[PDB]
Amino acid sequence: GTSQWLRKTVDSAAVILFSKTTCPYCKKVKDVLAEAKIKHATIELDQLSNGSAIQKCLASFSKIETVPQMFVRGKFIGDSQTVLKYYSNDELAGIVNESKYDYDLIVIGGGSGGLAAGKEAAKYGAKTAVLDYVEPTPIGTTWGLGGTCVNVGCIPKKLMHQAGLLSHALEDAEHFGWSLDRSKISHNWSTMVEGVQSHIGSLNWGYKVALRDNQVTYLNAKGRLISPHEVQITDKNQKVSTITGNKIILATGERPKYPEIPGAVEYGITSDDLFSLPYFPGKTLVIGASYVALECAGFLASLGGDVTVMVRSILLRGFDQQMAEKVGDYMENHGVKFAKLCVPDEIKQLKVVDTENNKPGLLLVKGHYTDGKKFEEEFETVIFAVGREPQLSKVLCETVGVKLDKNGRVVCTDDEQTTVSNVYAIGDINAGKPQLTPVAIQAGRYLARRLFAGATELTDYSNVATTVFTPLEYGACGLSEEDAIEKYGDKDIEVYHSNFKPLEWTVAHREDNVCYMKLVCRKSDNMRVLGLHVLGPNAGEITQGYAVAIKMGATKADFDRTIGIHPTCSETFTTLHVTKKSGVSPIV
C-alpha cells in the first residue's frame, strides 16, 4: 500500500527531496538547492505517521535507507555527499534539467482551471507550459488571458449586476433622507463597459505577470493533442510546430451554442459579445431560460432597457422549481417581459449595425407558441442563451484514445485521469462535474499537488453551493425539494420554510413577503439538512457559510442550537419552525 504510493510519487515528481525536519544534512541539501534557484517538492518523513515504512521503501529505488534522498524525474540522484559533489563540480544544473520531454506538464487552455493547475505545478519544480487561444466569435469579438469567467462570465456579469442593483440604492436613498430625485437620473452603457473592461484588462495583465514570476512558459497559441505526449501548436502567424510533455492537462472549456435557425449566427449575439459591446443593446430579446439568460436580462432591465425573455418550457431547468418560479415572478413584477412556451423560427435584418454612429441595428423575429399561435416582433438586439458546449474534436485527435461521453465531454476517474494514463481533464469539459469556476480551480490545484508533490487529497464534488445573480438573488446548497422527494419519498422529507423582509427594505417601502428560505430535511436520518435555499439580497454571502455545515453533515438540531446575528437576513435560518405539511402560512 505504501509501496505503491512511493513508486507513483517518485515516477511523476519532477524534482523531489525526501527529508526530515531535524536532520542538518537535509538542511545542507535544502540550502544548496535554494542557492541554485532549483524548485522542488519536499516530504518530511517525520511528519507522516508511516514515515518508517517510507524510509525503508525508498531503498527499493536508491539501495539506501537514510535521509536526504533527492530524485529527478524518477531517477535517484544521490545523498548529501553526492549532491554537493555535483554542485561544486558545476554538474548539478544539467542533472535537474535532464528530461525525455520538453515539459513536465502541458496545460491546454488558459482559464480558471488551467491557470490554477499550471501555477501550482510550477511551485514544485515542474517545467510547465500553459497554452491559451481565444477563437473569435462570429462578429469577431476576442479577449485576453484568463478564460470565460474573467473575460465573458462571472466577473463582468456580476459587475453589471452591481450597476443594476445601484438603481434601487438611488431609489431607497430618498426614503432614508437623501435629497436626490431618482426620476431625473439615467444610465450610460458605454461608461460602464469602459470601467468593466479596464478591470478585466488588469486581470489579463495580472495573470501574465503571475506566469512569468512562477517561470511558466505562456504560449498564446492553439494546442492540439496528436499523441499521448505530443502537442501541436499554431501561433498568431499560423506557424505550426510540435512540443512534448510528460503529463497533459486538458482545460479548454466551452463556448455558447446557437439555435439552428436562419439569421441566428448572422444577426444575433451571445454573452461572449455582450460584455464588451460598444453600443447599448436597446430593445432586446433574450432567447433562453438558463441562469445566464435570466441574469443578463435582469441587469439590462435595471439599467433601463426594454427586455423580453423567450422561454421554451421552464425557468432554470435543473434547479428547485418553486425557487425558480419565485425568481421569475420577481423579475416579471420589476419590468422584465416574458414570452412563455415559445421558440424562435428565424431572424431577419431590417437595419445593419451602425458601426460609425455607434448604434445597434434592427431585426424582425418570427417564432411560435407551443399551441401553434404565431410570434412576430421587432428588436434592436437578439441575445442567444441556449447553452454551452465544448468542441473537443478541435483539441483532440480521435486516435489518441481519450474517451468521450454522449455530450462530447471527457470521461474521467475520480482523480481527473482520462483513459490515457498520462492525460487528465479538469473544469467544464470533465463530464458530470458542476461547471463552476471555484470547482475548476480546486480540481486544478489538487491535481498538481498529486502529480508533482506526492499529495493524495481528492477534489470533493458533492453539495457545491451556487448563487444565481438575478435582480433578487437565489443561493442554494444541496438537493432541490423535488429531487429529495424523488430519492427518499414524500413521507421521509420535511420542509421548514419562512418568508422574511430585510430590515433595509422597511423604510424604503419594499415588498413584505417576497424573500423566502427553506430547509429540506430527512426525517429518518435525524432531520439531516439535504438542501438549503434562499431568495434575497446578498444570497451568496448568506449561503456560503452554511455550505461548510452541510459538508459536515448538519441537522435541523444544529441550526436550532446556533444563535442568530441580529439584525441580518441570514439569522432567519436559525429559528425556522413552520413545516409545509402543517399547512401554516409562512408569511410574517
Ligand X SMILES: Cc1cc2nc3c(=O)[nH]c(=O)nc-3n(C[C@H](O)[C@H](O)[C@H](O)COP(=O)(O)OP(=O)(O)OC[C@H]3O[C@@H](n4cnc5c(N)ncnc54)[C@H](O)[C@@H]3O)c2cc1C
Ligand Y SMILES: N#CCC(=O)N1CCC(C(N)=O)CC1
The residues annotated as belonging to the active site are 566
Q: Select the binding partner of residue 552 from ligand Y, ligand X, a copy of itself, none (C-beta < 5 to 8 A, by kind).
A: a copy of itself
Q: Select the binding partner of residue 265 from ligand Y, ligand X, a copy of itself, none (C-beta < 5 to 8 A, by kind).
A: ligand Y
Whole-angstrom distance, CA of residue 2 vs CA of residue 55 = 11
Cell of 82: 553526492
Cell of 338: 416574458
Say what angle helices 189-213 and 112-122 make with each other, to 10 degrees.
Answer: 30
Q: Select the binding partner of residue 435 from ligand X, ligand Y, a copy of itself, none (C-beta < 5 to 8 A, by kind).
A: ligand X
Residues of span 291-330 touching ligand X by CB under 6 A = 292
Question: In terms of CB distance, is 257 or 580 closer to ligand Y?
Answer: 257
Instruction: Confirm or reject binding of residue 252 to ligand X (CB under 6 A).
Output: yes
Q: Nearest-5° angle of CA 416, CA 290, CA 343?
A: 130
435 is known to lie in a ligand binding site: yes
Question: Which of 135-143, 178-186, 289-297, 405-413 is the region at the interface with a copy of itself (rule: CB under 8 A)?
Answer: 178-186
Whole-angstrom distance, CA of residue 323 vs CA of residue 520 = 13
CB within 8 Å of 305: residues ≥ 6 apart: 280, 281, 282, 283, 284
In 3D space, the residue among 144, 171, 192, 436 whose CA is nearest the CA of residue 299 turns out to be 192
Residues of span 545-574 touching a copy of itself by CB under 8 A = 545-549, 551-554, 558-559, 561-571, 573-574
Question: In terms of CB distance, is 134 or 423 closer to ligand Y?
Answer: 134
Question: Which of 111-119, 298-306, 446-454, 498-506 is the region at the interface with ligand X (rule: CB under 6 A)?
Answer: 111-119
Whole-angstrom distance, CA of residue 362 vs CA of residue 529 = 50
Q: Select the binding partner of residue 258 from a copy of itself, ligand X, ligand Y, none (C-beta < 5 to 8 A, by kind).
A: ligand Y
Per-position x/- string for 545-574, each x denoting binding to ligand X as judged by CB under 6 A, each - no binding: ---------------------x--------
Phi/psi zone of residue 532: left (φ > 0), alpha (ψ -120 to 50 degrees), beta? beta
CA 492 to chain centre: 34
Bridge partners of residue 218, in order along the sequence: 130
Per-position x/- string for 342-381, each x denoting binding to ligand X as judged by CB under 6 A, each - no binding: ----------------------------------------
In 3D space, the residue among 362, 381, 210 whose CA is nearest the CA of residue 305 turns out to be 381
Would the CA dihedral through 502, 507, 508, 510 be positive or negative? positive
* Residue in 154, 420, 549, 578 binding ligand X, rule: CB under 6 A: 154
Cell of 288: 433562453
Would the CA dihedral through 549, 555, 561, 566 be positive or negative? positive
Residue 374: exposed, middle, or buried by beta-carbon count in 10 A (0-12, 13-18, 19+)? exposed
81 is known to lie in a ligand binding site: yes
Whole-angstrom distance, CA of residue 296 vs CA of residue 282 = 13
Residue 385: count other Cβ atoms within 10 Å of its Cβ. Answer: 23
Q: How many CA atoms lie within 13 A of 174 on its CB side?
A: 10
Min CB(344)–ligand Y separation in Å: 13
Min CB(420)–a copy of itself separation in Å: 27
Q: Select the binding partner of residue 137 from a copy of itself, ligand Y, ligand X, none (C-beta < 5 to 8 A, by kind).
A: ligand Y
Per-position x/- string for 315-354, each x denoting binding to a copy of itself as judged by CB under 8 A, each - no binding: ----------------------------------------
306 is known to lie in a ligand binding site: no
Instruction: Confirm or reject binding of residue 183 to a copy of itself (CB under 8 A).
Output: no
288 is known to lie in a ligand binding site: yes
Min CB(199)–ligand Y separation in Å: 23
Residue positions forming the annotated binding site:
20, 55, 67, 80-81, 112-114, 132-133, 148-149, 154, 157-158, 222-223, 225, 252, 255, 288-295, 312-313, 317, 387, 391, 397, 428, 435, 437, 483, 509, 560, 562, 566, 574
Residue positions forming the annotated binding site for NAD(+):
288-295, 387
